[PDB]
Symmetry: D2
Subunit: 111 residues, 4 copies
Amino acid sequence: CPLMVKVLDAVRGSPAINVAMHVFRKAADDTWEPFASGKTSESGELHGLTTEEEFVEGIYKVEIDTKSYWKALGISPFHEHAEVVFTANDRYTIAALLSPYSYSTTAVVTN
Amino acid sequence: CPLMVKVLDAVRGSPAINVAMHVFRKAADDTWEPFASGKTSESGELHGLTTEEEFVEGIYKVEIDTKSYWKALGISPFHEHAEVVFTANDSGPRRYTIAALLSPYSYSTTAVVTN
Amino acid sequence: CPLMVKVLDAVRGSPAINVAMHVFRKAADDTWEPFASGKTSESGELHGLTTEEEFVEGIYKVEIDTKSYWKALGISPFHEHAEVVFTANDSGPRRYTIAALLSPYSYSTTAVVTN
Amino acid sequence: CPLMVKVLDAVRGSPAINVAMHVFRKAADDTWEPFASGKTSESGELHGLTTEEEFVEGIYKVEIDTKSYWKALGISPFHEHAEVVFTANDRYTIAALLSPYSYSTTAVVTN
Ligand SMILES: O=C(/C=C/c1ccc(O)c(O)c1)O[C@H](Cc1ccc(O)c(O)c1)C(=O)O
Ligand SMILES: O=C(/C=C/c1ccc(O)c(O)c1)O[C@H](Cc1ccc(O)c(O)c1)C(=O)O
């Protein structure tokens, strides 16, 4: 698991479950190539997105569909999605904490 | 205005209006003494808590009553209050802006300190 | 000023000054078209990006160049930029204030929307 | 583990390790009684603070010594400590994300 994403709900005080996200890698034409995707588990976590071999240096974007999440809860949200864009350089945990009109994201990088 | 507090609502995307807060200052006997209090305006801001002469060096605590704010909106929040504790003016007078961003089960707070 | 962006530095407790950002608007062909750009002032604020007439309904993206900000302070940060994507004016004209609070490995963003 | 505390460092992108904290329970004279304490592990987590039997309804305060943490890193901090005050009502994870002039805290409450 070189890359894990965890999503939390600041309104309900819970993991944010069934949140869909896509991971993209920046290509040489500066376009975003689909790389991996999935939805968060009951613990708010999404594991197994990639492998050590595949996860090479480059610029990656995690696009978290926060809008669909708030919509399912019947709460009007501000953002279309939450975006985390970063360079991988030679384990990454991306955490996102969601509110309807605000989000925060942090990275925990370990070894 | 060497001390201003601003409170924002992350659920509604608005200032948090009519939020009560109390400020305390640590006394020589290490007890918290009442220093100032007030509530946020329509802009989410609370101005005029103190003056440059009164706001001497010390350890200050701002207790923001976030629980009453959420309850009045029908929400049972996690925290009793948001608490901000800091040493002020240790290197001479500064202006302090304390900001708090509120959600029912979370809050963030930051300080902007100017000279 | 129906769109203002404010950026704060959580490491230094200050506005984040001279932070560049670009705003884009989604076109009919679903591509991001350049809309406005600028950099934050000494107050951490960027005003005057657009006008009420120009800021029509649509999906907007604000890309805040947080990486260059940290690099100039000697810090190699995690993120390439902070991105804020939202639908604007869907229920008529609103005023939007986007705030971002920056740390080297984290950022928070909120919106204040008024009518 | 009815109560766990996790602390993260937003400057270094890491768990905040060896962060001391004390947990207090509000007494009937509105004073704070020491209840439990400890310091965060290498994963930034503090477990085993209390038990199901002891952790009764009441108002609790977690006082996290963030100032000593930043001092050890040679970084001047704003806050004396980070405080989380909440009512327990009939598992609690308190997370804190730290920067020198800012902190955020959230609660993940599950069953
Ligand atoms: O605690 C957080 C996030 C807390 C948080 C608190 C305030 C914020 O603004 C914010 O963006 C995040 O994430 C950690 C991340 C994490 C999860 C599972 C893991 O295995 C791990 O190694 C790290 C957790 O949930 O244990
Ligand atoms: O209130 C905010 C937003 C702070 C904030 C606080 C926590 C967050 O997580 C976050 O994303 C943003 O910042 C400033 C605070 C402020 C600083 C200087 C001033 O003169 C002022 O009037 C307000 C603003 O509203 O202009």
